[PDB]
Symmetry: C3
Subunit: 172 residues, 3 copies
């Protein structure tokens, strides 16, 4: 599928993000089943909120949940499902499931794709509304099964550290 996409053209500040779910999609949590390579519904989330940004992952990375590193990509409008955006990390939302670490990175489009985010260097350069919504969305991002907690934010450096760790984890 996306295996032949590098994690980026110049890591960790220049990455490729495969988009699973476009911005403003309904509050539905999915997962890619590695065994069948199909997208499954996990949860119809108990929130009126919709996806605050486009949602997917960096190809050829490995996070602590066995899945590729998660990324939200802020764009002017929702992109096509399944498309790939060359991107630049600007921050990270820290999450722990009861199974471990579970970071959600924030990225903007690469300067080659648009001039609009060129001076967005940190996540705090984005509207406070968007950051609020992002936090509140993932506070409800979990399955029904009894047995997720949203901590704080990390900066651009912390996001780049997450990527480097995630890339090293995959090649290992």
């Amino acid at each position: 599928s996306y295996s032949k996409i590098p994690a980026g053209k110049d890591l960790p500040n220049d990455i490729y993000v495969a988009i699973e779910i476009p911005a403003n999609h309904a509050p539905i949590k999915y997962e890619i089943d590695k065994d069948t390579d199909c997208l499954f519904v996990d949860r119809f989330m108990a929130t009126p909120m919709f996806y605050p940004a486009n949602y997917g992952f960096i190809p050829n990375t490995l996070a602590d949940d066995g899945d590729p590193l998660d990324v939200l990509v802020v764009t002017p409008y929702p992109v096509a499902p399944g498309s790939v955006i060359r991107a630049r990390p600007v921050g990270v939302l820290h999450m722990t499931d009861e199974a471990g670490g579970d970071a959600k990175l924030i990225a903007v489009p690469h300067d080659k794709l648009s001039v609009l985010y060129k001076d967005v260097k940190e996540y705090t350069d984005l509207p406070a509304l968007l950051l609020e919504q992002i936090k509140h969305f993932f506070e409800n991002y979990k399955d029904l099964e009894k047995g997720v907690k949203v901590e704080g934010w990390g900066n651009a450096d912390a996001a780049r550290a997450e990527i480097t760790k995630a890339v090293a984890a995959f090649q290992k």
Copy 2:
């Protein structure tokens, strides 16, 4: 594609439904061409009505038209195209084309995915509006070529019977 998805985790009341077309999609009738594995437009339907629910099929089933068993899945909001919903049958709309039987099952999300439909056991537990719309939509679900009739509804048991028959038909 979806061949490695079982027809369900516990048949026939616990099924997997691959979604071709999300709820509220334009009135366009498609078919999967088995020979090329691509989705083709068959008809721009002569109705203002839009898809009343998500529309797809159960993998590894065989209906009397050579295609997998058709299913509509009622959800809070439209799902992503191509995603898979673990589901529970609640009824069936009976249709005959001039080529034979052509049932359209009604299913809700599995209890693992949402609490909202837990007490929806029969299709008649759903709003009468939705059932009207479903009937009126498929009354227009046909190609232009000269040479479809919508009868009535069957209950949850009848839907489960359709699934068991469809699963038996595939393994044969």
Copy 3:
């Protein structure tokens, strides 16, 4: 992917068009990377305008940019991403990038799919609004990299000539 789809059932007036981007999609320019077979974002376009029609290509054709022949397909409503529409050419918008020729064909659904466009034989049979929008959209259809110009329109015959040339180019 779409390699097993013929360029049409009866060339050049009866073609098959694989749709990448539905009508009314956000102003985002994509390309299919032949090496990875994935859809990439090229540009978030500097226009408020959205896709004026469905956008894709004819399988098994070869244009002067190494990509299959581009086509816009006018429909009542946006189609599903990735679906295939049997279509009929009615005109062409001429474009030159700084790299050569770059025609954008205009097609309507085949008579088998809908009665609505049966008497639309030329692109000038379509609303002048739509033609204006089409022209203005592609005036902004380009990457940011320094180094596209929209000329005029050709008729149905000229579009069919583009197809025949494109089909001959592929078999060569």
